[PDB]
Structures are given as C-alpha cells and as structure tokens.
Design a binder for this molecule. Structure first.
Ligand SMILES: NC(=O)c1ccc[n+]([C@@H]2O[C@H](COP(=O)([O-])OP(=O)(O)OC[C@H]3O[C@@H](n4cnc5c(N)ncnc54)[C@H](O)[C@@H]3O)[C@@H](O)[C@H]2O)c1
Ligand SMILES: NC(=O)c1ccc[n+]([C@@H]2O[C@H](COP(=O)([O-])OP(=O)(O)OC[C@H]3O[C@@H](n4cnc5c(N)ncnc54)[C@H](O)[C@@H]3O)[C@@H](O)[C@H]2O)c1
Ligand SMILES: NC(=O)c1ccc[n+]([C@@H]2O[C@H](COP(=O)([O-])OP(=O)(O)OC[C@H]3O[C@@H](n4cnc5c(N)ncnc54)[C@H](O)[C@@H]3O)[C@@H](O)[C@H]2O)c1
Ligand SMILES: NC(=O)c1ccc[n+]([C@@H]2O[C@H](COP(=O)([O-])OP(=O)(O)OC[C@H]3O[C@@H](n4cnc5c(N)ncnc54)[C@H](O)[C@@H]3O)[C@@H](O)[C@H]2O)c1
Lengths: 265, 265, 262, 262
C-alpha cells in the first residue's frame, strides 16, 4: 500500500511556525527527528533535546543546513529535572512550545518481559523517562507560559495506552495510559491562561523499532491496520505541527491517534 | 476572554483544498455555514446542503461572491435518502468529501424534555436526522469513493455524546454517542481503500443556539470551560479542513473534541 | 486447541439466594440466547420477570419453563419493542409495575453469514437495526421511567457491545452505531434519573455462545481463550440491578474475557 | 439541602454470605478509609485478608478489630508498598499465598487543602505520588503474579479515580496522571494474564466519605445527590473478585453516583 495524500511543497514549507521556539525531546532519532524536521521546515526555532551530545550536534547540523528554521542543542536526560533546566537555559532561548516525544520501550532478545518477570528497576526507569520526563519539561516551561498567557504542549501516548498491544511491556502501556488523563488535567489547569495541551497516540510507525519486531508480527500488525501500511514519521510530525498551530485554536485536552485505524479505542 | 491565536491571511486563504468537491450538510446556518466558508476560502468546490431552497441559494450567492472556491446548491432533507441522492446528482458533480454537520436538538420553551416526558416521535425525528442522515450521505458517496480509492468523511458528534450536558435531551446525547463508534467502524471498513473517516465533538460554540440557552446557563458553561470562552464556528471549521487535508494523512477513526476543555472525556 | 474450561463456579446455595425477591423485572429479547439466560437468572434470584419477545408461542413456552423452577415467576409480554404503543399495551396487560428493565433485544443482520459493508447497505436495513437496537431501548425506558421517577426507585440495564467501542469485522455499521449510541445514552440517562435515585448502566458483551471458523478466530483474539457463557452476562445484569452496586451508575461494563478491550 | 438518604440496603443474611471462603486477599491501604471498608467486607464474606498499610500499630489494631467479628481472618502486613523488597518480605512473613490483591493504597497530596498546580509542583512530590499510586500497584502485582500464573488462578482489582478520566479541580496533576495510568495498565494486565484465567479490573471512585464547602460542591455535581459510602466501593471489589464476574476483565468501573462520568 503506497502513500496517497501528498502535500505540495509550497504548503509543506509554509512559514506557519515562524517566530516560535519549540522544544522537542527525543529529537535525534525516529519520530522526534521527523518532528524536528517538520518544525524547521515551518520556520520554527527548535531545541534538539536528546541524550548524546554528538547525536544532538549532528541533528542540529543537518537541520541548520536546510536554510529554513534554526536548531539549537539541548543534550540531557529528560528524567533529570535539574539537568534539563540547565540545558534549556544554556540556549538563552525561551521556549513557548514543547513536544514530549522521548520514550523507551525496553525489550529482551526482541521480546517484552511479562509482568510476572518484570524487574522493578526496569519498570521504574520506563516510568521515569516516559511519564516523569514529560512532567519535567512541562514543570520547567509552564511558569513562563502562564506568565506570558501563551504556550502549546504536545505529549506522546500510544494506542497501547488505550488497548492491548502484544508488542509492548506493561510499563510502556501504563506510562502511555498516564499521558492521556495527564493531558486532560493539564489542559484544564492551563486553559485559563490560553495554553493548549494535547497528545498524539501513534500506532505502528516506520521507525528503527520495526526491525526489532519479528517479521511475522509486523506483517500481522499491518494486516490489523485498515489503511494497510505502517505510518510514516512525517505523518506524526504533521499532527504535532497542527496541534501547535493557530488552526487548532479551540482544541485542547485531546489524544489523537495517528494509527491508520489500528487498535482503535 | 479574547481570541489569542490568529491565523495570518496568507495562510487562511492558501489553496489547500483546490480540486476538491466537498459536500457539507446543514451548510446554510451556524457551524455548517462557517465550514462552507472555510472550504471555499481554501479553494474547494462546496455542495451547500440544507432544507430551504432560498437559504441554500442565498448561501451559494454569498460564497460565490468571494472569488475563491465555488458553491453549488443541494436543497434537501438529509434524512430522505432518495431525495438526497437526487439533489446530489442534480449538481453533476462527484463529491470526494462529505462533512456531516446537519443536526437538531429540539427544546420546548427553551428547555430539553427529560426522558420520562419525551415524545417517541421527537426521539425518532432526532435519530432520523442526526444519525440516519449522517449514514445517508455516507451510503450515497462511498460507492464512488471506494471505486476511486479516494475519499474523506468528517462527522459531527458532541461532548454531550461522551458525558452529560444538562442542556440537551437524551435523543441528542444518544445520536451524538452513536457517531463516535460509527466513525471507528467506518474507518475500519473504508481504510483499505485509503478513505479516512473522523469526527468532531464541539463543546459550546458561539452560534444561534446560544440565545436559546438561559443566560445563567451559558455563564456557567463558560465558567466550566478552561479556556474561558465560547468556541468560534471558524475554529470548528479549521478542524474539518485539517481532517480532510493531506496533513492528517494517517489519522482515521478519531473523534476530536473542539471544546476548549469543557466536559473532557 | 482453543477453548479453556470454566474456572469460577458459583455454589448452588449462592446461585439461588433470594437477592431480587419482590422485584418486577422486564427483560426484552427474553425468549432465547442471552435474554433467556438473564430471565433464568432473575427467576433463580426470586424476581418476577416479564418475558418480552416477538413470538407469543416462544414467550409462552419460556414462561412455562421458568415457572416450573419453583422460584421466581414469569409473565408473557409478546410484542415488537420498536413499536411503542404495542409495547405499552403489552406491559399494561400484565398488570405489573416494573421497577427494572434489562434491554437485551437486539439484531445484527448478516447475509449468508457476512455483514454488509456501508457502501452496499440497504437504508431500510440500517433503519430497522436503529429502530430495534436503539429506539427499542428508548421505548422501554420511556414507558417505565414515569413510574420509576414518581417512586424515586428504579434500575435500568442496557446492552451495548465491544463492537460499539472498537471495530469488530463480524458486524455491520448499523450494529456498531446503535451499540455505540447505548454508551452515551446510558451516561445521559444516569444523570437525568440520578436525582430520583434511579441507576442506569450497560453491559458490553464480547463473544457469547448464543444463537465456526469465525468463532475460532474470535476465541484466538480473546485473552481468556474461550467464548463467554450467557449465564455470565446474566450475572452482570443481576449485579447491576442489585443493592451491591448501589453507587454504580452510568457505566458500560464489558463482558468479554479481554476481547476487543476499549 | 444536599445529601440524599441511602436507598438500597443489602439484608444481613446476604451481606454475610461466605462468598469468599477459602480466599486469601491482600488489601493495600487497609488501615483506614476505603481500604479499611474493603477489608471489613472481605472478612464479612469469610475471606482471609492481608492488612497492608504503613504503621504497624494501625495495622495491628485493624487486625484485632476485624478478627473480633468471628468471620474471616485478618493478618498484618506493615510496609510501604512502594518499596518492593520490603513488600515482598512482609508478604513472605505472613506465610500466606495471596490469590487476590486489591490495590487501594494511594495518596493525593494537598497544601492546606489546595492542590498545587503543575507550574508550582515540586518534582519530588510528583515522584512520590507516582511511586505510591502507580509503582506501588505494580509492586504487588509483580510480587503475586508468579504464583497466580503458575496456579492459573488469580484476581486483581486496582483503584483508579474519575479524576483519571476527566478533570477534577480537587486533585493535582500527579494524582490525575497516576490514576489515568491504572486504566490502561489494567487492560494490558488483563490481556497478559487472561491466558492463565486471571482476571484484572479497576474501580474508579468519585467522591467517597473517607478521611466542607468543597464536598458540598461535589455533592451538587453528583446526580445521585450524595457522597458514596466506603462500603459501596467495597461491594464492587467483592463482586470483581467473585465468581459472579467470571467473564469480566480489563474493566474500569466508576463508583461515583454519576459524578464526572467519562
Ligand atoms: N515507533 C512507533 O511505532 C511508535 C508507536 C507509538 C508511540 N511511539 C512513541 O513515539 C515516541 C518516539 O518513539 P520512536 O519510535 O521514534 O523511538 P526511538 O527509540 O527511535 O527514538 C527515541 C529517541 O528518544 C531519545 N531518548 C530516550 N530516552 C531519553 C531520555 N531519557 N532523555 C532524552 N532523550 C531520550 C532516544 O535517544 C532516541 O533518540 C516515543 O514516545 C514512543 O513511545 C512510537
Ligand atoms: N452549536 C454548538 O455549540 C454545538 C455543540 C456541539 C455540537 N454541535 C453540532 O454541530 C452541528 C451544527 O449545529 P449548529 O449549532 O450550527 O446548528 P444550527 O441549528 O444553527 O444549524 C444546523 C443547520 O442544519 C440544517 N438542518 C437541520 N436539519 C436538517 C436536515 N434534516 N437536512 C438538512 N439540513 C438540516 C438547519 O436548517 C441549519 O441550517 C450539529 O450537528 C450540532 O449537533 C453544535
Ligand atoms: N451474543 C454475543 O456474542 C453478543 C455480543 C455483544 C452484544 N450482544 C447483544 O446481546 C443481546 C442479546 O444477543 P443474543 O446473542 O442473545 O441474540 P439472539 O438473536 O440469540 O436473541 C435476541 C432475542 O431478541 C429478540 N428480539 C429481536 N428483535 C426484537 C424485537 N424487535 N422485539 C422483541 N424482541 C426482539 C429475538 O427474537 C431473540 O429472542 C443483543 O442486544 C446483542 O446485540 C451479543
Ligand atoms: N475517597 C475518595 O473520594 C476517592 C476518590 C477516588 C479515588 N480514591 C482512591 O481510593 C483509595 C483509597 O482512598 P481513601 O479515600 O480511602 O484514602 P485514605 O487516605 O483515607 O486511606 C489510604 C490508606 O492508604 C495508606 N497508604 C498510603 N500510602 C501508602 C503506602 N505507601 N504504603 C501502604 N499504605 C499506604 C494510608 O496510610 C491509608 O491508610 C486511594 O487509591 C484513592 O486515591 C478515593
């Protein structure tokens, strides 16, 4: 199944996010790298947040070569609140938007551990990164957003947070489920200051994780997808662009699946 | 609370929906009229479907005066399948998109009847219009969409279909609830042909219905809205534009609230 | 290699406790399938049950079978639940005041075992499914809530489906839409009727052994690795109408063994 | 002018039926509030209960009170549920194999009665709420599911909240996030554990009279026009661990009288 909906270049590169400073976590690989690409294409300045300085610097060099938006490095572990704040403030920029995309889904020899064999320290690390890392950026940035009465937040859930995916472990499902109600609650607290908070729940996206899934499983997942293909990272990025744009100006608290019909709930 | 997110004109009038034929039901007043405005502004051809020929013709004259997209008249009752098909085909156009916006919410002296006083014929009429009218356009248009492997559908639910609103009667809540699971099911049936199906669930929108609600009730509803205002019809229209655009190309089966945080569920 | 054995057996002493003594319970679709098992369960709990279904002979036979149990009592209510006037007349003819209704009547039309897709669906078929599954459930609630409200006493259980919350390839779009309608209808009713102490809930069954490769695939998709039994749906309807769910209202509880969770 | 009287009274003969005889049920947060009422209910149904809470004196007093009822039995399990090793050691010290756990332990920190907003929230406070409400619930499930899986027998009930599905202005964001986590965690567990006949469900209470203008506003928002009683939450936990919910798994059932339905 091929791609059917192609956005013309003149629309793809419109400066919809000019004069915006957008923090993107997990931006050096995968969906986060595609989200960074899309915001730069829309003329935003992006903060490239990821773990390894070389990965972050390479990403900034790639993006800055496009002659569109600008990319600045923010190398840190999002679960370390003080290190995150220090790396954000080292840029000298004030970020009006955060896309929380960093996330982990640990496996062992390619398979997720079941709850009865799950190491507590693995559970805790996944909670720290997937859930508390998303709180951390929001705690860091919302004082400024509230004072400015201006801000946009997009979090990343998963269809596995709303129904069972046999590909993930229980910590992943629990943390992605947490994001949904967290996003509603945040939308209510921050709405009075005109700040909007939404989440994306991707299904199965063409990403490095695909090679780690057994080929029969990926085949079955595509068979379980009405649109009959994996999603592209750029399609998730299009949703993050829209949720942070003036064309979703009354949309808040929502979790939008980006999944082609897979595992609807 | 004033509007904070203003889309520049150069983006508002971009020809994102050029060469698209978009059927809009309930297009002569309210949110549907704003949806028709938005699609014409994006260079689509729109089929103006509403009950009264004079209302429909006036709407087409207004829209065609903009020098952007084109509007054609489709005067019919969406609950009458044969009359709907006849009015669609009288235009000589093939519609690749339908926005099901027509809906009714009957009240008596400004108040909704409770279930224990609800006339069965009133229940049935609301079901006929709100639910079966939405099926009718989809039944009429999906043979062509499936054959073309091309099509977009947007339905209209309500936050009252997912949680209780004291402003509506039970037929309204039931029909708007129906839309949510109907939309998921349709997305799964039509996805193999690359057709996407989504729904919008508006909260409280600045529309003629506002005057029919007691002022204390509207005041309380705005107080229950985190973003502290009614939504604008154009903000719902922005969501319909996006859900029918190439920038939501992997989004299907979703119900997106357009409600500023009111009655999140 | 598919179906697991039953693991949770209620003892007879507890199965037959008079938990619903002095209750009058209307059950639609009661002549066969899940509805027949719901009727059996309420009679076992010493309730009086109204057996509502289409065919008088089927309804009369069901009443005779249940009344032979020597526990609760069963009375006949032969009518099409989508016909409000006929429903009211049939209820009136029993002389009973029903404090509870379990809306179980429902249809899922297929054609030689295959559901029609939306693009090929006859509008008359869509309308009939809406009339029975959705408006038939409204009809009983409209008929009975005046009395329930006046008494500040009543219990309602509606029947949704996992297919109303996510896609089941076994059903057509009218079924999905009507079962989806029940979920928000049930929340709305719970709020309207709550001030009068009336509770309103719904059940969303998965795949229940009622009236083969398709069922094997459904079992493969069910974590608990079996079909549900009609009596297990009946246990949920008993609980949702009992004093032991006294603060539970507006809820849709799946009865599905993990199938199609949403 | 707010609270309605109780309308649905379970008779004593049915309240004290031995529905959970020969069951070993671990209850976290059992020394007060809803957890104490859950413990009371299981003992009334002749179960053996593990009373898990922080303070040994509180836990010992609770066991003494319950054991004086002459029905089920209560054993002490004093530990912080967020400490996996301490939890396992305290369970091991009872010498009991628990076939059921009700995860009720939870915290909702406030400051002089007001929840902190996200922009002013101490990260340490967020982390502690995550550790107790979410990871503490994982900890008991990790400790007990090896035995449940090996036996192909077990029941789990977790505790969410209506605030995990929609906004409650009474709670802070950590509470909302952790209670939201429980819903999808429960579905995932139901699927993983279902092949072994283990059922996993959750309760989402609304506003329960546990440890005034704020509560009056909550009653005004509740269709049934009263606070819930702890025993009514306990009735749901009894049912979800009983043979009469034998095909129900992965579900989150609100216990809220219509408050904040979502
Ligand atoms: N790929 C899919 O199909 C899919 C589906 C549903 C949801 N998601 C979600 O989308 C997001 C992106 O996933 P992906 O597939 O692109 O993953 P990925 O592993 O390819 O990339 C994740 C990136 O985040 C970074 N990261 C991890 N932990 C971090 C930390 N503590 N601090 C900072 N950066 C950190 C990694 O270094 C990496 O660059 C995740 O939240 C994931 O759960 C992905
Ligand atoms: N206004 C709100 O706050 C709000 C909130 C949630 C959902 N909605 C939904 O948005 C949609 C638009 O509502 P609105 O407030 O603009 O209403 P409206 O009453 O102002 O306009 C509805 C339009 O639909 C037309 N219509 C009605 N029945 C029709 C039929 N059988 N065939 C064809 N056209 C028909 C009417 O003539 C009218 O022009 C409805 O589906 C409504 O349920 C509105
Ligand atoms: N069996 C399942 O796996 C399953 C799954 C999900 C939901 N459900 C729902 O459970 C309910 C019972 O299903 P079942 O499997 O027992 O079905 P069934 O077809 O075996 O029995 C349904 C009964 O309802 C009666 N009925 C139908 N239309 C009626 C009408 N207009 N008036 C009065 N009675 C009418 C039928 O005559 C029959 O006795 C239905 O609402 C169904 O949609 C069933
Ligand atoms: N009361 C309500 O209205 C309401 C509403 C929704 C959800 N809930 C949930 O119901 C559950 C019970 O609430 P409650 O109102 O009875 O609260 P409570 O504060 O009265 O009692 C909770 C009990 O848990 C214990 N506990 C706390 N942290 C613990 C830990 N780390 N280890 C062991 N025990 C610990 C406390 O000591 C206490 O005995 C909680 O999960 C709560 O979030 C309550």
């Amino acid at each position: 199944m091929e791609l059917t909906e192609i956005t013309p270049e003149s629309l793809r590169l419109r400066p919809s996010h000019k004069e915006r400073n957008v923090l993107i976590t997990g931006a050096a690989r995968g969906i986060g790298r595609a989200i960074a690409q899309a915001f730069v294409e829309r003329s935003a300045t992006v903060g490239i947040c990821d773990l390894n300085l070389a990965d972050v610097a390479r990403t900034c060099e790639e993006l800055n070569g496009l002659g569109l938006g600008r990319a600045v490095p923010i190398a840190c572990d999002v679960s370390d609140y003080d290190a995150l704040v220090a790396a954000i403030d080292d840029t000298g920029l004030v970020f009006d938007t955060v896309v929380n995309n960093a996330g982990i889904s640990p496996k062992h020899n390619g398979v997720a551990h079941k709850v009865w064999e799950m190491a507590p320290d693995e559970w805790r690390r996944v909670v720290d990164v997937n859930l508390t890392g998303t709180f951390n950026t929001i705690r860091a940035l919302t004082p400024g957003m509230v004072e400015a009465r201006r801000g946009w937040i997009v979090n990343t859930s998963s269809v596995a947070g709303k129904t069972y995916s046999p590909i993930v472990a229980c910590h992943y499902a629990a943390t992605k489920s947490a994001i949904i109600g967290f996003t509603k609650h945040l939308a209510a607290e921050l709405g009075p200051y005109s700040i909007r908070v939404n989440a994306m729940a991707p299904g199965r996206i063409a990403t490095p994780m695909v090679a780690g899934v057994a080929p029969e499983v990926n085949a079955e997942q595509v068979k379980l997808t009405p649109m009959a293909r994996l999603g592209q990272p750029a399609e998730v990025a299009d949703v993050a662009l829209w949720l942070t744009s003036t064309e979703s100006s009354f949309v808040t608290g929502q979790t939008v699946d980006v999944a082609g019909g897979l595992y609807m709930a």
